[PDB]
Structure 1
Amino acid sequence: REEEEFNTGPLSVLTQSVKNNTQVLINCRNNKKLLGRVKAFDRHCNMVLENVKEMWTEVPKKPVNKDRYISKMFLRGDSVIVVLRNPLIA
């Protein structure tokens, strides 16, 4: 019931990220896009990823864009707004 819904619904789009070890992008509510490989997921979209690259844009408070890299991180499913899977690892 739960496994078939996870392997046949939208969560299968997450399950293709951890099985085939592909890179996907996650756009959050803080105007930040983190591209990385999804290592661990759950039913509440708790994404524990490794080797992530997060890019955004900031103002001095003209503005300018910036980016950074993290070895391993974990983000909750509440702040995850958009999740895009694209063949970028090849």
Structure 2
Amino acid sequence: PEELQKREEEEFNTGPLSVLTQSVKNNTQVLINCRNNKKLLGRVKAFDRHCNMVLENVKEMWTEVPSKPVNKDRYISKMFLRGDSVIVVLRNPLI
């Protein structure tokens, strides 16, 4: 109800996902690591309690060995990522 929604808003604003609340406040890009060693950097439009994220204008980079591996990357306009494959989410990336 309303009290459960207020508790969920308090847990999203003051809990571990508050950095994710930084993704929807100032529209800052976050970097999420996947299970297949593919780091996706992008803004997060929608989130949930199960860490399911909706990314807009994201860039997914990974290492693929053909020797030395190359940094093959791709750019997706809109994407959705489940919380089961999310390993580490960084709020402020380096570059």
Paired-residue identity, %: 99
8 Å Cα contact 2:31-2:93 kept in structure 1? no
More strand by share: 1
SS of the equivalent of 2:21 reads helix
**TM-score (structure 2 length as normaliser):** 0.85
Equivalents in 2 of 1:62, 1:8: separation in Å? 43
8 Å Cα contact 2:30-2:90 kept in structure 1? yes
Deviations 1:29-71 (A, max 9, x none): 1011100000000110110010000000112293322111000
Bigger radius of gyration, 1 or 2?
A: 2
Which 10-residue stretch deviates more, 55-64 or 11-20?
A: 55-64
Change (3 A) 1:74 1:61: farther
Q: CA deviation at 1:10?
A: 1.1
8 Å Cα contact 1:23-1:88 kept in structure 2? no
Q: Which runs of 5+ in 2 are unaligned?
A: 1-6
Which 10-residue stretch deviates more, 23-32 or 54-63?
A: 54-63
Aligned residues: 89
8 Å Cα contact 2:34-2:86 kept in structure 1? yes
Equivalents in 2 of 1:40, 1:76: separation in Å? 12
Change (3 A) 1:39 1:84: same
**TM-score (structure 1 length as normaliser):** 0.89
Which 10-residue stretch deviates more, 80-89 or 63-72?
A: 80-89
